[PDB]
Design a protein around this nucleic acid. Structure first.
Ligand SMILES: [Mg+2]
Lengths: 474, 419
DNA sequence: TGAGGTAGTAGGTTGTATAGT
DNA sequence: CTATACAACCTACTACCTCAT
């Protein structure tokens, strides 16, 4: 009978340096970490897109309840929640028209149809941002359904809608839109006409196609908390994080396009205590491995990344961090790490940590309907442990993984550290996701966003973008 | 002297607001008396409200919800402020907190219908400002705010009922450890007897081709019916590698490393499993990665095992609990079992299209809760077992792999009261 | 919340080495 | 060059997990 230690749940700290466990409650109770002058919201949507968005801004001022407000906290309303106004009176609109939508949308190719509406929005956004004397804190892209429906690979507009035959015989619109807008940094928050106005989108039966009555309070929390983060201030910070750590999350994406199938973009995302995050964009190499089904780096690029992270940290924090954890889902080749070692200052401790959600040690509580509460961990080796970032959470009285939860193996592949701090720091790092405001995420924010980030690297590759904060990459 | 801000509220209808107002207020400096903070146990408990309303309550806040006006307890709570409204002889002693978008005048109690509207309807924040700004206009007492107080309460009171508690609880794994491994692992320079082009997975034993040598836990003698003219191999000739060494890593051969060896056992273990289910009473669901095994309808009496219900019905489709075997060497070699829900319209004929299955599985899954998922799986392992302590996986006639039916148990102090 | 998309993981299908003409 | 004896992909298929949230 092995024994499970327990990791006390990390506390994220909100206004007045008062800390608790649920951002939803932490913000609702005290508000954001840095209260901000009111958000000025630009809209890049159909004249309808404005009314819906306006429906939301107006809607969220008032409280909005979830189905059960223990499992999902209610949303007091934006002003009560964030102590500032995200006013619908104050919108700064750049219109798009069906004529624009129809004209661009219809092209036979998905890609020529995608890449150009993407181009359309940016000029509309870019023109507003660069040109405006008037300033908008966030640009919200209100995507008519007609865009969402058809701007993805594998979605086939009938041959009976296409005005022009394809000129010749990536493609996800929103990510691209973030990617193109990447070189000039602007915060893009993308919304779907359907989500904002979901009861105004009935199906043939006349019931709404997607019905959110259960989680409507929740949506606002996710949107605002993200909207809040883009507009300036972070909602919250990790409460008791020992000074001077660096969490670095290694992100790659395979570039399918290259004839040689090793062409995968590379990144590292730097998190300290806030999760505002900094995304260090690495340039494109032969990272993917055919034999190994793995991602990896040559030292010379690898040295630039750690350094790019270390130096920016220093420009940021006036010293080199005394502890650096590099997380990734893969083991580290000794040569790859040794590249990392060499760049690193002498007394800084560099830890590589492989967080792999392989399907192991599904643990079933003996008694009761509910599963093992989250924070239980089993420690395999001084090096290797299993962490439950998912599982029943009593503040919620709900389980976080809605099935029996799957713990994540954590191994300090390279470097030496106390596994107990590792589990701790990772349990902490699930608390930092500004964009999806939940009690905690399954994955630490280091590697949580890689799959989304990965598209963004590749979708824009000409660019050599400076290291940037998350809101830009969100 | 009187400092308090008593909040009269309906529960649980205005609980979300009442809790928000008090905590926000308490944090702001105010002293708030609300039922929400306490856990009263006394006859006076009505009295406590009355004494507090009677004497120390500077302001009476009442939740102006439809429920609040029609509530017996609140209406009783209300009774005093009016009784005590005069004594104060302050007009603004009672404050309707109109939090409800939908109050007919008819609902509103007459006493407070008259009164001024503290509008939490349009926004909660404006209402707080309005409630507070009204507090400025009349000098309602305050302390410098310490939100520390605000969430000491929230953390201590509201969160009191459910939090991590030092409790003891054991959890059953889905890793059922292998018990016994064949004393040696041997490699046969099968050579001429060996044909590369043949497939051995109709060889009724775990066999895989590594290099030019032959790999398995079956002694060389084991394959006859399907491998002729191999009475020609010296007993001596094949390598005979200590298994009890390999897990250790005691065996590293520059020709082949333990990592290589460790990977190898696993196809066998899984294969060993795959065969045994060939003859262990369960029809197998095939997923591309590996097979899933679900007992057919009626195999177990009334479709239940050991009191567990491993076959059932959903809609027009029967569901059949099924399982898979991952075998993993490390940290401790074990059989890993992931659980499945197969689907049949009729008791033994499998459903054609996954999409119906994927829908079935998600729809069916919602019913089973941690308690249910564990019992069915353990029983299913319990079901397979060919003996009291373990399952039997047959590599070879004299060589067998034994895996405990009951998975590893982890005991942790620290758990939560079941709601 | 849930209809989606992702991420494991095997493999059989497949594209490269070897080898003999 | 062209047989194949193999290597290393690529592909369903499924359990999770996310978002144009
Ligand atoms: Mg988002």
């Amino acid at each position: 009978m092995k024994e499970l230690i327990y990791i006390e749940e990390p506390s994220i700290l909100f206004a007045h340096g008062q800390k608790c466990t649920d951002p939803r409650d932490g913000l609702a109770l005290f508000g954001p970490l840095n209260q901000i002058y009111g958000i000025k919201s630009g809209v890049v949507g159909t004249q309808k897109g404005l009314q819906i968005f306006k429906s939301y801004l107006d809607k969220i001022q008032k409280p909005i309840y979830n189905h059960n407000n223990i499992t999902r906290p209610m949303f007091p309303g934006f002003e009560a929640v964030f102590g500032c106004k995200w006013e619908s009176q104050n919108i700064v609109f750049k219109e798009i028209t069906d004529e624009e939508i129809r004209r661009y949308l219809f092209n036979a190719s998905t890609h020529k149809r995608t890449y150009d509406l993407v181009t359309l929005f940016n000029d509309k956004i870019i023109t507003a941002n660069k040109n405006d004397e008037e300033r908008v804190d966030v640009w919200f892209v209100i995507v008519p359904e007609e865009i969402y429906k058809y701007c993805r690979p594998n979605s086939v507009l009938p041959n009976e809608l296409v005005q022009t035959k394809s000129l010749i015989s990536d493609a996800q619109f929103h990510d691209q839109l973030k990617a193109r807008l990447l070189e000039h940094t602007i915060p893009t928050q993308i919304l779907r006409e359907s989500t904002l106005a979901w009861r105004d989108f009935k199906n043939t039966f006349g019931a709404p196609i997607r019905d959110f009555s259960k989680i409507e309070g929740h949506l606002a929390w996710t949107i605002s908390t993200a909207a809040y983060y883009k507009a300036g201030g972070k909602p919250w910070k990790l409460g008791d994080i020992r000074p001077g750590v660096c969490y670095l999350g290694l992100v790659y994406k395979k570039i399918e396009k290259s004839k040689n199938p090793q062409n995968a973009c590379c990144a590292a995302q730097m998190f300290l205590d806030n999760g505002d995050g900094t995304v260090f964009k690495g340039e494109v190499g032969p990272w993917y491995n055919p034999e190994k089904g793995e991602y990896h780096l040559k030292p010379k690029e690898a040295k630039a990344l750690l350094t790019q992270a270390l130096e920016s940290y220093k420009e940021q924090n006036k010293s080199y961090p005394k502890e650096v954890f590099i997380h990734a889902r893969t083991r580290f080749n000794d040569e790859e790490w040794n590249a990392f070692n060499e760049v690193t200052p002498k007394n800084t401790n560099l830890v590589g940590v492989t967080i792999t959600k392989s399907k192991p040690l599904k643990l079933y509580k003996t008694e009761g309907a509910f599963p093992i509460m989250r924070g239980n961990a089993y420690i395999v080796d001084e090096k290797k442990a299993f962490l439950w970032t998912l599982g029943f959470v009593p503040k919620l009285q709900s389980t976080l993984s809605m099935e029996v939860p799957n713990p994540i193996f954590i191994e300090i592949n390279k470097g030496e550290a106390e596994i107990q701090q590792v589990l701790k720091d990772i349990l902490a790092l699930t608390k930092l996701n500004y964009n999806a405001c939940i009690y905690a995420d399954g994955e630490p924010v280091t590697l949580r966003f890689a799959n989304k980030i990965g598209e963004i690297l590749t979708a824009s590759t000409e660019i050599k973008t400076p290291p940037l904060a998350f809101k830009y990459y969100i | 002297m009187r400092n308090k801000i008593f909040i009269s509220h309906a529960t649980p209808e205005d609980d979300d607001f009442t809790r928000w107002l008090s905590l926000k207020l308490i944090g702001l400096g105010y002293e708030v008396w609300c039922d929400i903070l306490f856990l009263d146990k006394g006859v006076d408990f009505w009295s406590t409200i009355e004494k507090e309303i009677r004497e120390n309550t500077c302001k009476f806040l009442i939740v102006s919800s439809t429920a609040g006006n029609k509530r017996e307890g609140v209406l009783k709570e209300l009774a005093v402020a009016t009784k005590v409204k005069k004594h104060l002889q302050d007009d603004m002693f009672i404050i309707p907190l109109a939090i409800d978008e939908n109050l007919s005048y008819d609902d509103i109690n007459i006493e407070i219908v008259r009164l001024n509207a503290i509008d939490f309807k349009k926004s909660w924040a404006k209402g707080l400002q309005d409630l507070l700004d009204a507090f400025e206009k009349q000098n309602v007492p305050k302390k410098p705010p310490d939100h520390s107080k605000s969430n000491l309460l929230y953390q201590q009171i509201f969160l009191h009922d459910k939090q991590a508690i030092e409790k003891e609880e054991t959890y059953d794994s889905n890793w059922f450890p292998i018990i016994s491994f064949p004393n040696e692992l041997r490699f046969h320079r099968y050579d001429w007897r060996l044909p590369k082009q043949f497939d051995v997975r109709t060889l009724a034993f775990p066999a895989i081709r590594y290099k030019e040598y032959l790999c398995t836990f079956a002694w060389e003698y084991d394959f006859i019916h399907q491998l002729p003219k191999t009475e020609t191999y010296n007993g001596q000739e094949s390598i005979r590698i200590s298994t009890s060494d390999i897990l250790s890593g005691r065996y590293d051969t520059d020709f082949i490393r333990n990592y290589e060896c460790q990977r190898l056992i696993v196809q066998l273990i899984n294969k060993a499993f795959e065969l045994r289910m060939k003859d262990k009473n369960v029809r197998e669901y095939q997923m591309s990665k590996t097979f899933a095994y679900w007992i057919e309808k009626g195999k177990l009496e009334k479709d239940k095992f050991e009191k567990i219900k491993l076959v059932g019905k959903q809609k027009n489709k029967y569901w059949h609990f099924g399982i898979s075997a991952a075998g993993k060497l490390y940290p401790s070699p074990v059989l890993m079992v992931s659980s499945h829900i197969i689907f049949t319209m009729d008791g033994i004929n499998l459903i054609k299209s996954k999409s119906i299955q994927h829908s079935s599985r998600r729809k069916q899954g919602k019913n089973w809760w941690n308690d249910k998922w564990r019992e069915k799986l353990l029983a299913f392992i319990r079901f397979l077992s060919d003996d009291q302590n373990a399952i039997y996986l047959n590599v070879g006639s004299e060589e067998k792999i034994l895996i405990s039916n009951k998975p590893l148990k982890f005991f942790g102090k620290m758990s939560y009261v079941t709601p």
